[PDB]
Subunit: 29 residues, 8 copies
Amino acid sequence: GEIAQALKEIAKALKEIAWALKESAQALK
Amino acid sequence: GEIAQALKEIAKALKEIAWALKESAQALK
Amino acid sequence: GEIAQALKEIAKALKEIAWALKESAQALK
Amino acid sequence: GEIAQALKEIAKALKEIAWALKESAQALK
Amino acid sequence: GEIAQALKEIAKALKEIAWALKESAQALK
Amino acid sequence: GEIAQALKEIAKALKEIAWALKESAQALK
Amino acid sequence: GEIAQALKEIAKALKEIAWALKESAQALK
Amino acid sequence: GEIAQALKEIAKALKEIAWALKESAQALK
């Protein structure tokens, strides 16, 4: 369904935020 | 549908937050 | 509809958060 | 409606988070 | 209604996050 | 109701995030 | 119910974010 | 159900954000 698909797109965007924060941890080290 | 479309706009905004955080990681490097 | 409109306002606020974080990346560089 | 109104209050709170993050970018500059 | 009331509690918690971030901006200055 | 109760648990978790951010502001001061 | 259970899992994940931020406050001090 | 499943994917993504923030706390220590 379209709502479930849109919520999955929100989860994928939150994973992108996690990847960006992992890169910030590498920059700090 | 309009609710699914609005949730997709929220996903796009969250991706913009990830892009901005990547810019911070590059600034620290 | 009113719910879709309110979710679009949430997306616009998340874009404002992204813009603020982009400014933080410029400040770090 | 009360749900739409509550979602608008969430959008306003997210805008307050953006304003606070802008204050951090100005402090770093 | 109970759902609207719970969403208002989420908005109040997001305002608390904004206040904490404003304090971080004062600490950076 | 169980949905309202779960949303209240999300509000409480967001307040915990605010408390943690206040600890960061105090560490910077 | 399954939706209430999934929202409780979101609250637990937000608590994990708070714990990670508390650790960052300890690192800054 | 598909909505509950999508919300569980959002919880998992939020846990990934917590893991990334823990990596930042370790980098600061």
